[PDB]
Design a protein around this ligand. Structure first.
Ligand SMILES: [Ca+2]
Lengths: 287, 109, 50, 54, 264, 106, 51
């Protein structure tokens, strides 16, 4: 029923063709319940020039949505298209491109409408403008498409960093708990709150790189879990350095001990300073 | 109610054997349901000492609903029947008097 | 019979105590032994037919 | 009625003879001829509801 | 022998469905491991009671999918240098509590081969077990019945659902023409069935709505994700088999998810 | 102990019909059990001149428990039987003597 | 039923002499001939229409 949610956060509709503002989406992925819209504004057909006027100054980097800020053409179809690229690790990236016609955008331009017409059988966008110029112009090959993949992932990731560090460039090790708790959704288990309230010492912080890497690590969650099959069935709880080289070869993204020690310090309720499979992975499969 | 029980018992075994599954997988329940009864009857006879014939089994059940119906309604029953005894007992005696009075024949006893 | 000859109402007929649950204490623990002495029989009989 | 009763129970057995043996399969008639049995043991109870004597 | 072993035939299936490896390898292990169903082994100069650690390794040589075991290969390479001998290898083998070592590091057991040979070794083993199973279904004219090719799926999936079980039986009504299923038109499908993990991922947009892409581009996107081609008819019976809802398509809850969770 | 046997004959046939055998292989046994029972319910009548009717057939068993047991505990039932009627006779004779319409005692 | 109306106890109901044998020795050998009549009947039955 994602469509019904898409109606909630969206406030721009055209004969039922609800267009999403760039902010609504970013709010649909950051916040969970927001209702202040009270608007059917876009009916005046300013849309056809509204977006194209403002997209001409878009930041191709990690600000492609932090540059427009609630003005842009985002269709419900494209909305879901971001949801699927939300969860793609590096592995699926080439495949997600290869899932499309893979013969260059000459065969992938129509795939956009094909993306649209797919939802129809089931029953001028900002991206298409950035992907195909004005009327199907730009030849957005894989790497160019891949560029748009990672930064937009980083973007939603990055903006999340501020929402917990309250804008400051540093996130208290205590703040980093809620994000994990908001991730694992096992927050009602006070034992972890009991764990963090004493085991964690309110001290230094975590920068964006250490957090953005960790968030990216979870994008590759599965490949890590498989590399942990031999140990999970062995039930031997993992040590820090073991866990580092593990996630190293698992995701390809190194982490900082300043994170995982806390991750250990919060997830090692057994008190052995070693993460068994049911300790970390067990709660991670709550959602 | 027993007729209803006996009615659906003929439907939920009719549709379930012509439109639905089959005969050859209902028969091994068809049989097990009759033999299912035959225990209940026997179980009834062990539960209470009657061979479970309807015109009797009704009256026993009726008799429960009466006592449970009367004892709930607080209406006395012991003193009622004792009254009803005293009537017939006294009545039947008056019947014995028909011989020596209306007929002058010796009284039977 | 609802009432005796005098018209008096017959006594509340006796229902065996816990009967409906007294009977399950024998039929149920015997339905099972009714089954298990089939397993130990079919396997005891398979070696010469089916 | 006694004769008329029997004559029924001698034709109902005459119907299910031709049908079963040399017009259909017994595996076709049987699922009826259990119902007829149960049909009787339903009426033979219905009679007790109307009449109130077995 | 009607009901003699139709308990153990299901029990051993239930063991092979989900159980502890202890008795699983007690069935010696030298080559009895082929009991894991219901030409590498000629090169198995093994020792009968080999291990259960290697067993854990062994099924993963068939359990881990294509792109993922590269990481297991990388995880195996904690020494780096593109090569790791028994030191790390046999250690993580011991943490749970030989021919492969003689097949990898030579009969000398010391000469460390390039552990890149982990892939090809994984390739043939997935083939051979699939091969021997193909003969277990007695390929007539090098081909097997569509109800057999569908049967092994059920044997692969290992699910207990009477409906699709009967659908496996009812397929001769849905397919009475008869074509036979060759060993290649089934091996390509399993390689796809191996890398299911990425398919649903690649299929997530469809998953956001459903219908598992009308059975044709399904086969097309298969080759994309599976790196191997399938025919048309090979998958038509699969969609004909797993069409539990009768819609003519699949939900994730119809076919895909069951495959996904199968990797337990 | 009747209902016990009358339950295993449902147990024995529960398994033998679905689990471990067919039904078309086990139906002809239940029939030759019905028409074997309904022979006993007749042979029982030839042995003792009454029908297998639960209340009666229970009692006619109950007595054979009694006369056997009473024979063991040795007490002269014949006397008790004899001595019992006289009570229910002398008493009846008294109720006939205190007849409230037949003055004998004022 | 079980006790006389006066309160006395019913007499010892009768069991015929070894009747349980008297019934086996007449059901078994006639259970046996019921078989034998069929097999011989089966022969004549096979020499004609049905089987
Ligand atoms: Ca039958």
């Amino acid at each position: 029923l994602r469509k019904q949610r898409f109606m909630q956060f969206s406030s721009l509709e055209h004969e039922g063709e609800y267009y999403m503002t760039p902010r609504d989406f970013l709010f649909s992925v950051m916040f969970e319940q927001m209702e202040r819209k009270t608007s059917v504004k876009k009916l005046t057909k300013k849309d056809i020039e509204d977006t194209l006027s403002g997209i001409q100054t878009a930041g191709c980097g990690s600000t492609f949505f932090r540059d427009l800020g609630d003005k842009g053409l985002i269709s419900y179809t494209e909305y879901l298209f971001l949801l699927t690229i939300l969860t793609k690790p590096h592995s699926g990236f080439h495949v997600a491109f290869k899932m499309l016609d893979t013969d260059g955008n000459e065969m992938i331009e129509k795939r956009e409408f094909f993306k649209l017409q797919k939802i129809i059988s089931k029953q001028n966008t900002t991206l298409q403008m950035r992907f195909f110029g004005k009327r199907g112009q730009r030849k957005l090959h894989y790497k160019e498409f891949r560029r748009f993949m990672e930064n937009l992932q980083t973007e939603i990731q990055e903006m999340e960093f501020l929402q917990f560090s309250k804008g400051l460039s540093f996130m208290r090790k205590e703040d980093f708990a809620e994000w994990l708790l908001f991730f694992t959704n096992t927050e009602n288990k006070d034992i972890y709150w009991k764990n963090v309230r004493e085991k964690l010492s309110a001290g230094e912080s975590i920068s964006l790189d250490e957090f953005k890497s960790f968030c990216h690590f979870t994008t590759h969650l599965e490949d890590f879990a498989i590399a942990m099959q031999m140990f999970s069935l062995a039930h031997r709880p993992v040590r820090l350095a073991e866990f580092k080289r593990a996630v190293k070869v698992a995701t390809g993204q190194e982490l900082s001990n300043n994170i995982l020690d806390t991750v250990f310090k919060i997830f090692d309720l057994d008190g052995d300073e070693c993460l068994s499979h049911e300790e970390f992975l067990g709660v991670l499969k709550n959602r | 109610g027993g007729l209803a029980y006996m009615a659906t018992q003929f439907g939920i075994l009719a549709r379930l054997t012509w439109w639905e599954y089959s005969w050859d997988i209902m028969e091994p329940v068809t049989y097990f349901i009759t033999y299912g009864s035959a225990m209940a009857m026997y179980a009834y006879f062990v539960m209470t000492r009657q061979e479970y014939v309807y015109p009797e089994a009704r009256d026993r059940q009726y008799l429960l609903f009466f006592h449970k119906g009367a004892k709930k309604s607080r209406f006395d029953l012991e003193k009622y029947n004792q009254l009803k005894d005293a009537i017939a007992q006294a009545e039947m005696d008056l019947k014995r008097l028909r011989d020596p009075l209306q007929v002058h024949l010796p009284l039977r006893q | 019979v609802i009432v005796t000859r005098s018209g008096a109402i017959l006594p509340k007929p006796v229902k065996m105590s816990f009967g409906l649950l007294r009977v399950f204490s024998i039929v149920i623990p015997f339905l099972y032994v009714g089954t298990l002495i089939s397993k130990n029989f079919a396997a005891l009989l398979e070696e010469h037919d089916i | 009625v006694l004769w008329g009763g029997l004559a029924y129970m001698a034709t109902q057995f005459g119907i299910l003879a031709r049908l079963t043996w040399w017009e259909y399969s017994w595996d076709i008639m049987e699922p009826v001829t259990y119902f007829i049995t149960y049909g009787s043991a339903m009426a033979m109870y219905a009679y007790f509801v109307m009449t109130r004597q077995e | 022998s009607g009901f003699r072993d139709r308990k153990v035939m299901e029990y051993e299936n239930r063991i092979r469905a989900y159980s502890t490896p202890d008795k699983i390898f007690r069935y010696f292990t030298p080559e009895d491991f082929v009991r894991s169903i219901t030409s590498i082994f000629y090169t198995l100069g093994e020792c009968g009671l080999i291990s259960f650690s290697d067993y854990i390794f062994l099924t993963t040589v068939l359990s881990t999918p294509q792109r993922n075991f590269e990481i297991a290969f990388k995880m195996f390479d904690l020494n780096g240098d593109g090569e790791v001998d028994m030191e790390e290898f046999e250690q993580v083998q011991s943490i749970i509590r030989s021919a492969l070592t003689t097949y990898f590091f030579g009969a000398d057991l010391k000469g460390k081969l390039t552990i890149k040979n982990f892939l090809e070794f994984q390739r043939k083993l997935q083939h051979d077990v699939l091969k021997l199973e193909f003969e277990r279904h007695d390929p007539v004219d090098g081909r097997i019945t569509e109800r057999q090719f569908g049967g092994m799926l059920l044997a692969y999936s290992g699910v207990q659902s009477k409906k699709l079980t009967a659908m496996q039986r009812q397929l001769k009504k849905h397919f009475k023409e008869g074509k036979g299923l060759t060993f290649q038109e089934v091996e390509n499908f399993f390689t796809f069935l191996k890398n299911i993990n990425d398919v649903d991922t690649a299929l997530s947009f469809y998953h956001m709505a459903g219908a598992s892409l009308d059975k044709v581009t399904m086969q097309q996107v298969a080759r994309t994700v599976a790196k191997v081609e399938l025919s048309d008819h090979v998958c038509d019976v699969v969609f004909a088999l797993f069409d539990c809802d009768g819609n003519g398509e699949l939900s994730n809850k119809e076919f895909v998810s069951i495959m996904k969770q199968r990797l337990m």
